[PDB]
Structure 1
């Protein structure tokens, strides 16, 4: 149902390749590799660390975490077709695992992960399932564990305009405020909860990607169609406009179990 919706619409094989073109190789979220590098700049891991990537996607996050730290990366994504694409990008590495599964029904041992890592994935979850997931993450984290999240946020729903309401509706996103997000983590007894409104930095990332799309339009049209260019071009235009006025926000979240 949730799996079928994502596979058959937003995350078809073609829809993801469109995303990857503008995001960067092996990514389906803003900034691609360069944003991932900055998000993990203050993260300390090594060859003995166990890492969970909720909504791993094409596996770009797991590839980087393993390359940089040498840590065991386990990536969970609900879309089977995407996992199949991710597995075909990694070979001869037993410390990178990709699994097609709903994170809400996936079982992990308590006190297992040093790092639980998620980028632009939890927005697909309802408010009730956000809370359920973060209770599960608290359990899954080692006592010395750390939770790292970047996700789409927004201003209060009362302030949304017609275009943004439609966008959230058709994407079936559940967008809460950065403040409501952090309170969920606090309610789940996460310690040292640090929330950052990185909508300005996100806006910068969007501008680069938008500029890239325009300067590679010919290469894009060879790969896809004008129709998908227009949807991608207008989509980024709206995100640039809305991120600037803080209507659609980019939340950063770091927390520990103790």
Structure 2
């Protein structure tokens, strides 16, 4: 039971990709006439619009700059052969670089990983076109906000995808989902770190970090970059009354965050799947940007920092904790760990240099490695002590990997290879 706010959000999603352009040809697949007309009225005279009410009518659409598909796939999401026909027809109808905005409510789909599985399905599909393939490049998955605020529904999704040419090479997103942040990896991490957290020290430590923002007020807006399974965002909202928007590139991670907020219900918290280095955030809109033990994953720190600066309100504050590299002689074992994780580590000097260049003022940096060491020791006595309860849930292979990993990090700290760094700063004015 949606409202016109939904169609406006669908068009905003389109403009994340096409920016100031008005699309010349738009197709709309939407079986409900009122929603379809609401979408049509969003466009002006520079746009020609074609609409249909069933997917087989997509055969009549071509050369589209954008295809908006709204609540049309109830059958397809339960039937791969029908879904394949749709993806095929969608790809044929779009120009190369054309944008698909797909809205589908998954709240009546009991399977909680459905959003993630659909995203992977779209990302993998290939169609022969000419002497190569075409397929969809991933941009984002957003929640329909009307559904959160009016219907307590966090599982109403909008995919933003773009048609691209492909050869006949694993993505960053797929690397995260297939290696470090598999479902079993995620839940094994949560077990050691603490409920809802994938970061050192769990709830108590995250609260201590949040306090280093200084005074925060109810209703202020926070962007959480690399929100994981949501514990930090949920805590910022529940403890300080912040409105928190969390983003993560991993669908495995966000599937958990989304399942949990949909069940528990807190309208202060919303989530999006996207790459925080690419995604179009509203400029000058956030009071705070928080990133907890995420950015060691991100190579282009300069780009990230400029994007953070852009998204902050003047006077707003950024606070980040991250794995970093120390000043000791690097061991081959640490280097293999770094290479296998694909971490792009920096030291505090480097972070401060980048923050100054970006234009941040009031820069604070801290080497929190001694606290990191305490946390690793406490965490390890816990896995070692609760071995029997762990083995009831996960494999022996998973268990030994946690024990050996924590042992290893302790030695990496000892050589001053592995550091745990803090950075905060403010946008001028």
TM-score interval w.r.t. the shorter chain?
over 0.9
Q: Give the counterpart of 2:245 among 74, 77, 98.
A: 74
Matching residue of 1:160: 330
What are the Cα deviations for residues 108-145 of structure 1, in whole angstroms up to 9, with x where unaligned? 1211111000011111111xx11101001111111120
What are the Cα deviations for residues 155-174 of structure 1, in whole angstroms up to 9, with x where unaligned? 25x83111001000000101
Richer in strand (by share): 2
- 2:344 aligned with 1:174: yes
Please tell me whether the aligned partners of residues 330 and 415 of structure 2 are also in contact (alpha carbons under 8 angstroms).
no
Structure number with larger C-alpha Rg: 2
Please tell me whether the aligned partners of residues 254 and 273 of structure 2 are also in contact (alpha carbons under 8 angstroms).
yes
CA distance in 1 between counterparts of 2:226 and 2:246 reads 7
Richer in helix (by share): 1
SS of alignment partner, residue 152 of structure 1? strand
- 2:271 aligned with 1:98: yes
Q: Give the counterpart of 1:216 among 386, 390, 406.
A: 386
Please tell me whether the aligned partners of residues 199 and 244 of structure 1 are also in contact (alpha carbons under 8 angstroms).
no
- 2:283 aligned with 1:110: yes
**TM-score (ref. length: structure 2):** 0.58
Alignment map for 1:110-149 (pairs within 5 Å): 110-126=283-299, 129-149=300-320
Q: Post-superposition shift, 1:101?
A: 1.0
Q: Post-superposition shift, 1:81?
A: 1.8
What are the Cα deviations for residues 146-199 of structure 1, in whole angstroms up to 9, with x where unaligned? 00000000125x831110010000001011112212211111111011100000
SS of alignment partner, residue 392 of structure 2? helix
Please tell me whether the aligned partners of residues 180 and 341 of structure 2 are also in contact (alpha carbons under 8 angstroms).
yes
What are the Cα deviations for residues 58-116 of structure 1, in whole angstroms up to 9, with x where unaligned? 11111110011111100000011211111111132221011111111111121111100
- 2:246 aligned with 1:58: no
CA distance in 1 between counterparts of 2:283 and 2:205 reads 30
Instruction: Between the two structures, name the one with larger relative contact order (CA 8 Å, sep ≥ 6).
Output: 1
Q: Give the counterpart of 1:8 among 178, 186, 190.
A: 178
Please tell me whether the aligned partners of residues 200 and 244 of structure 1 are also in contact (alpha carbons under 8 angstroms).
no
Unaligned runs of 5+ in 2: 1-170
Unaligned runs of 5+ in 1: none
Q: Post-superposition shift, 1:244?
A: 3.5
Matching residue of 1:238: 408
SS of alignment partner, residue 146 of structure 1? strand
Please tell me whether the aligned partners of residues 76 and 99 of structure 1 are also in contact (alpha carbons under 8 angstroms).
yes
SS of alignment partner, residue 411 of structure 2? helix
Q: Post-superposition shift, 1:241?
A: 2.0
**TM-score (ref. length: structure 1):** 0.96
- 2:361 aligned with 1:151: no
Q: Give the counterpart of 2:255 among 57, 62, 84.
A: 84
